[PDB]
DNA sequence: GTAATGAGCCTAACGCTCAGCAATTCCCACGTAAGA
DNA sequence: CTTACGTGGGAATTGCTGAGC
DNA sequence: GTTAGGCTCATTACT
Protein backbone atom coordinates (compact mmCIF):
# COMPACT_ATOMS: atom_id res chain seq x y z
CA UNK A 1 0.00 0.00 0.00
CA UNK A 2 1.68 3.17 -1.28
CA UNK A 3 1.68 6.43 0.69
CA UNK A 4 2.37 9.95 -0.57
CA UNK A 5 2.29 13.31 1.15
CA UNK A 6 -0.83 15.32 0.34
CA UNK A 7 0.46 18.19 -1.76
CA UNK A 8 -0.16 21.50 -0.05
CA UNK A 9 -0.44 19.73 3.28
CA UNK A 10 2.99 18.13 3.53
CA UNK A 11 3.96 17.22 7.09
CA UNK A 12 0.31 17.21 8.13
CA UNK A 13 -1.51 14.53 6.16
CA UNK A 14 -0.77 11.69 3.81
CA UNK A 15 -2.72 9.58 1.33
CA UNK A 16 -2.58 5.96 0.19
CA UNK A 17 -3.46 4.48 -3.19
CA UNK A 18 -6.17 2.47 -1.44
CA UNK A 19 -8.04 5.60 -0.48
CA UNK A 20 -6.77 6.08 3.07
CA UNK A 21 -6.16 9.57 4.44
CA UNK A 22 -3.84 9.57 7.45
CA UNK A 23 -3.21 12.48 9.83
CA UNK A 24 0.19 12.85 11.45
CA UNK A 25 -0.59 15.13 14.40
CA UNK A 26 -3.96 13.47 15.00
CA UNK A 27 -2.31 10.04 15.07
CA UNK A 28 -5.27 8.22 13.55
CA UNK A 29 -6.61 8.01 10.00
CA UNK A 30 -9.57 10.14 8.90
CA UNK A 31 -12.87 8.25 8.68
CA UNK A 32 -14.63 8.65 5.34
CA UNK A 33 -17.78 10.70 5.13
CA UNK A 34 -20.31 9.03 2.85
CA UNK A 35 -23.16 11.51 2.15
CA UNK A 36 -26.26 10.87 0.07
CA UNK A 37 -24.45 11.52 -3.20
CA UNK A 38 -22.23 8.63 -2.14
CA UNK A 39 -18.72 10.12 -2.61
CA UNK A 40 -16.19 9.66 0.20
CA UNK A 41 -15.04 13.00 1.59
CA UNK A 42 -12.80 14.15 4.43
CA UNK A 43 -11.70 17.46 5.89
CA UNK A 44 -8.08 18.58 5.84
CA UNK A 45 -7.02 21.40 8.16
CA UNK A 46 -4.44 24.03 7.30
CA UNK A 47 -3.64 26.85 9.71
CA UNK A 48 -6.70 26.60 11.91
CA UNK A 49 -8.95 26.48 8.85
CA UNK A 50 -10.13 23.13 7.47
CA UNK A 51 -11.31 22.44 3.90
CA UNK A 52 -13.41 19.56 2.52
CA UNK A 53 -11.84 17.18 0.01
CA UNK A 54 -12.95 14.15 -2.06
CA UNK A 55 -10.99 11.00 -1.25
CA UNK A 56 -11.10 9.82 -4.83
CA UNK A 57 -9.67 13.08 -6.15
CA UNK A 58 -6.85 12.97 -3.61
CA UNK A 59 -5.97 9.45 -4.70
CA UNK A 60 -6.20 10.28 -8.38
CA UNK A 61 -4.18 13.48 -7.92
CA UNK A 62 -1.37 11.60 -6.27
CA UNK A 63 -1.36 8.17 -7.92
CA UNK A 64 -2.84 8.70 -11.40
CA UNK A 65 -1.13 10.04 -14.52
CA UNK A 66 -3.30 12.10 -16.84
CA UNK A 67 -4.39 15.10 -14.82
CA UNK A 68 -5.24 18.11 -16.98
CA UNK A 69 -7.15 21.26 -16.10
CA UNK A 70 -10.90 20.86 -16.14
CA UNK A 71 -10.63 17.08 -16.13
CA UNK A 72 -12.76 14.95 -13.89
CA UNK A 73 -11.94 11.82 -11.86
CA UNK A 74 -13.80 8.71 -12.90
CA UNK A 75 -14.57 5.48 -11.02
CA UNK A 76 -14.13 2.85 -13.73
CA UNK A 77 -16.40 0.30 -12.06
CA UNK A 78 -19.10 2.71 -10.97
CA UNK A 79 -18.46 1.60 -7.41
CA UNK A 80 -17.94 4.87 -5.53
CA UNK A 81 -16.81 2.83 -2.53
CA UNK A 82 -13.96 1.35 -4.55
CA UNK A 83 -11.40 4.09 -4.33
CA UNK A 84 -8.24 2.22 -5.18
CA UNK A 85 -6.12 4.28 -7.55
CA UNK A 86 -6.33 1.44 -10.04
CA UNK A 87 -10.10 2.02 -10.28
CA UNK A 88 -9.80 5.77 -10.93
CA UNK A 89 -8.65 7.74 -13.98
CA UNK A 90 -8.62 11.32 -15.22
CA UNK A 91 -11.29 11.66 -17.85
CA UNK A 92 -13.11 14.31 -19.87
CA UNK A 93 -16.68 15.09 -18.71
CA UNK A 94 -17.80 14.25 -22.24
CA UNK A 95 -16.15 10.86 -22.00
CA UNK A 96 -17.57 10.16 -18.55
CA UNK A 97 -21.03 10.70 -19.99
CA UNK A 98 -20.42 8.75 -23.19
CA UNK A 99 -19.72 5.83 -20.84
CA UNK A 100 -23.12 6.14 -19.25
CA UNK A 101 -24.50 6.25 -22.72
CA UNK A 102 -22.68 3.01 -23.58
CA UNK A 103 -23.96 1.38 -20.43
CA UNK A 104 -27.38 2.84 -21.29
CA UNK A 105 -27.89 4.20 -17.81
CA UNK A 106 -28.15 7.93 -18.50
CA UNK A 107 -31.78 8.95 -17.95
CA UNK A 108 -33.38 11.74 -19.94
CA UNK A 109 -36.93 10.47 -20.36
CA UNK A 110 -37.83 11.50 -16.85
CA UNK A 111 -36.90 15.08 -17.63
CA UNK A 112 -38.84 14.97 -20.91
CA UNK A 113 -41.99 13.65 -19.24
CA UNK A 114 -41.82 16.51 -16.76
CA UNK A 115 -41.03 19.07 -19.46
CA UNK A 116 -44.04 18.20 -21.60
CA UNK A 117 -46.02 19.38 -18.57
CA UNK A 118 -43.83 22.17 -17.28
CA UNK A 119 -43.22 23.99 -20.56
CA UNK A 120 -46.87 24.73 -20.98
CA UNK A 121 -47.80 28.33 -20.42
CA UNK A 122 -51.50 28.89 -19.63
CA UNK A 123 -53.07 31.39 -21.98
CA UNK A 124 -56.34 33.26 -22.18
CA UNK A 125 -58.40 33.35 -25.36
CA UNK A 126 -60.72 36.22 -26.21
CA UNK A 127 -63.50 35.50 -28.71
CA UNK A 128 -64.70 38.10 -31.22
CA UNK A 129 -67.93 38.11 -29.19
CA UNK A 130 -66.04 38.98 -26.01
CA UNK A 131 -66.15 35.70 -24.11
CA UNK A 132 -62.88 34.46 -22.69
CA UNK A 133 -61.60 31.03 -21.64
CA UNK A 134 -58.30 30.01 -20.06
CA UNK A 135 -56.49 27.06 -21.65
CA UNK A 136 -53.56 25.02 -20.28
CA UNK A 137 -51.26 25.67 -23.26
CA UNK A 138 -51.19 27.53 -26.56
CA UNK A 139 -51.09 24.07 -28.07
CA UNK A 140 -54.19 22.80 -26.26
CA UNK A 141 -56.16 25.86 -27.35
CA UNK A 142 -55.08 25.75 -30.99
CA UNK A 143 -56.34 22.22 -31.13
CA UNK A 144 -59.70 22.88 -29.49
CA UNK A 145 -60.35 26.06 -31.46
CA UNK A 146 -58.67 25.20 -34.75
CA UNK A 147 -55.88 27.76 -34.60
CA UNK A 148 -52.23 27.77 -35.72
CA UNK A 149 -49.56 27.77 -33.04
CA UNK A 150 -47.12 30.05 -34.81
CA UNK A 151 -49.88 32.63 -35.11
CA UNK A 152 -51.30 32.36 -31.58
CA UNK A 153 -47.75 32.88 -30.28
CA UNK A 154 -47.24 35.99 -32.41
CA UNK A 155 -50.29 37.52 -30.85
CA UNK A 156 -49.15 36.55 -27.37
CA UNK A 157 -45.80 38.33 -27.93
CA UNK A 158 -47.35 41.42 -29.50
CA UNK A 159 -46.04 40.65 -32.99
CA UNK A 160 -49.56 40.35 -34.33
CA UNK A 161 -52.64 41.91 -32.81
CA UNK A 162 -55.05 39.05 -33.56
CA UNK A 163 -55.61 35.80 -35.38
CA UNK A 164 -58.72 34.25 -36.87
CA UNK A 165 -60.75 36.87 -35.03
CA UNK A 166 -59.44 35.90 -31.59
CA UNK A 167 -56.68 37.53 -29.61
CA UNK A 168 -54.51 36.06 -26.88
CA UNK A 169 -52.88 37.05 -23.60
CA UNK A 170 -50.94 34.99 -21.05
CA UNK A 171 -52.50 33.99 -17.77
CA UNK A 172 -50.20 35.60 -15.19
CA UNK A 173 -49.85 34.39 -11.60
CA UNK A 174 -49.95 30.61 -11.23
C1' DG B 1 -9.63 26.16 34.19
C1' DT B 2 -10.80 29.13 29.23
C1' DA B 3 -9.85 28.98 24.12
C1' DA B 4 -8.13 27.70 19.40
C1' DT B 5 -8.23 23.23 16.75
C1' DG B 6 -9.32 18.92 14.52
C1' DA B 7 -12.41 15.07 13.49
C1' DG B 8 -17.23 13.86 12.17
C1' DC B 9 -21.59 14.81 10.03
C1' DC B 10 -24.65 17.26 6.85
C1' DT B 11 -26.89 20.45 3.56
C1' DA B 12 -26.68 23.47 -0.35
C1' DA B 13 -25.23 24.31 -5.13
C1' DC B 14 -23.88 23.87 -9.74
C1' DG B 15 -21.93 21.83 -14.41
C1' DC B 16 -21.88 17.70 -18.29
C1' DT B 17 -24.62 15.50 -21.96
C1' DC B 18 -29.09 13.80 -23.07
C1' DA B 19 -33.32 14.04 -26.58
C1' DG B 20 -38.82 14.72 -26.64
C1' DC B 21 -41.96 18.34 -26.92
C1' DA B 22 -44.28 23.40 -26.06
C1' DA B 23 -43.18 27.67 -27.38
C1' DT B 24 -41.08 30.59 -30.66
C1' DT B 25 -39.17 32.87 -34.72
C1' DC B 26 -40.06 34.37 -39.05
C1' DC B 27 -39.58 33.40 -44.40
C1' DC B 28 -43.47 32.55 -47.67
C1' DA B 29 -47.76 32.67 -50.32
C1' DC B 30 -52.15 34.82 -51.33
C1' DG B 31 -55.89 37.94 -51.88
C1' DT B 32 -56.76 42.68 -51.79
C1' DA B 33 -56.35 47.68 -51.49
C1' DA B 34 -53.04 51.53 -52.60
C1' DG B 35 -49.18 53.59 -55.26
C1' DA B 36 -47.12 55.99 -59.66
C1' DC C 1 -48.92 46.94 -63.52
C1' DT C 2 -45.97 47.51 -59.60
C1' DT C 3 -45.85 47.71 -54.42
C1' DA C 4 -48.16 47.56 -49.69
C1' DC C 5 -50.67 45.55 -46.28
C1' DG C 6 -53.44 41.95 -43.88
C1' DT C 7 -53.74 36.99 -43.14
C1' DG C 8 -52.83 32.50 -42.13
C1' DG C 9 -49.18 28.26 -42.93
C1' DG C 10 -45.80 25.82 -41.12
C1' DA C 11 -40.49 24.52 -41.29
C1' DA C 12 -36.50 25.25 -38.56
C1' DT C 13 -34.84 26.87 -33.82
C1' DT C 14 -34.82 27.59 -28.65
C1' DG C 15 -35.12 26.30 -24.22
C1' DC C 16 -36.70 23.49 -20.47
C1' DT C 17 -36.13 19.23 -17.67
C1' DG C 18 -34.26 15.50 -13.98
C1' DA C 19 -30.97 11.76 -13.93
C1' DG C 20 -26.57 9.50 -12.98
C1' DC C 21 -21.96 11.25 -13.21
C1' DG D 1 -19.28 14.85 -11.53
C1' DT D 2 -17.39 19.34 -8.25
C1' DT D 3 -16.84 22.92 -4.40
C1' DA D 4 -18.33 25.54 -0.27
C1' DG D 5 -19.92 26.22 4.27
C1' DG D 6 -22.41 24.99 8.54
C1' DC D 7 -22.98 22.33 13.00
C1' DT D 8 -21.45 19.32 17.10
C1' DC D 9 -18.10 17.40 20.07
C1' DA D 10 -13.70 15.93 21.40
C1' DT D 11 -8.95 17.16 21.26
C1' DT D 12 -5.33 20.09 22.55
C1' DA D 13 -3.94 24.71 24.01
C1' DC D 14 -3.36 28.55 27.23
C1' DT D 15 -5.73 33.88 26.27
MN1 LIG E 1 -18.19 7.27 -14.34
SR1 LIG F 1 -44.99 26.13 -16.63
SR1 LIG G 1 -41.92 26.76 -17.16
SR1 LIG H 1 -35.34 30.85 -38.12
SR1 LIG I 1 -57.18 52.11 -59.46
> Residue A59 is inside which H or E element, if any?
helix A55-63
Whole-number Å distance between alpha carbons of A77 and A157: 51
> Quick check: A14 and A22 in contact, CB under 8 A?
yes
Distance between the alpha carbon (CA) of A116 and the C1' atom of B9, Å: 39
Near-strand C residues (CB closer than 7 A)? A 74, 78, 96-97, 99-100, 105-108, 110-112, 114-115, 118-119, 147-151, 154, 160, 162-165
Residues A130, A61 within the same domain: no
Residues A32, A4 within the same domain: yes
Burial group, residue A73, by CB count within 10 angstroms (0-12, 13-18, 19+): buried
Q: Is the CB of A37 under 7 A from strand D?
A: yes
Q: Which residues form the domain of A123?
A: 107-174
Quote helix, strand, coil % in chain A, to nearest 5. 30, 25, 45
Q: How far is the CA of A90 from the centre of ligand 4 (A)?
A: 40
Residues A84, A163 within the same domain: no
Whole-number Å distance between alpha carbons of A24 and A18: 18
- Which of A62, A89, A106 terminates a domain? The answer is A106
Q: How far is the CA of A162 from the centre of ligand 5 (A)?
A: 29
**Nearest residue to A62 via CA among A136, A103, A3, A144:** A3
> Residue A45 is inside which H or E element, if any?
strand A41-46
Residues A134, A49 within the same domain: no
Q: How far is the CA of A108 from the centre of ligand 1 (A)?
A: 17
Q: How far is the CA of A124 from the centre of ligand 2 (A)?
A: 15
Q: A127: domain CATH number? A: 1.10.10.10
**Non-local CB neighbours of A136 within 8 Å, separated by 6+ positions:** A120, A122
> Quick check: A52 and A41 in contact, CB under 8 A?
yes
Residues A99, A112 within the same domain: no
> Quick check: A11 and A4 in contact, CB under 8 A?
no
Residues A134, A76 within the same domain: no
Residues A33, A43 within the same domain: yes
End-to-end CA distance of chain A: 60
- Which of A86, A106, A126 terminates a domain? The answer is A106
**Non-local CB neighbours of A64 within 8 Å, separated by 6+ positions:** A73, A85, A88, A89, A90
Whole-number Å distance between alpha carbons of A23 and A1: 16
Resolved by: X-ray
Q: What is the b/e burial string over A16-31, where b = at least 16 CB atoms within 10 angstroms of the residue's CB?
A: bbebbbebeeeeeebe
Q: A46: domain CATH number? A: 3.90.75.20
Amino acid sequence: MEWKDIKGYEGHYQVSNTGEVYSIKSGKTLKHQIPKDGYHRIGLFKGGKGKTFQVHRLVAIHFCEGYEEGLVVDHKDGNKDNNLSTNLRWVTQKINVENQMSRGTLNVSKAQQIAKIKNQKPIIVISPDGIEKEYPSTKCACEELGLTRGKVTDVLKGHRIHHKGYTFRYKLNG
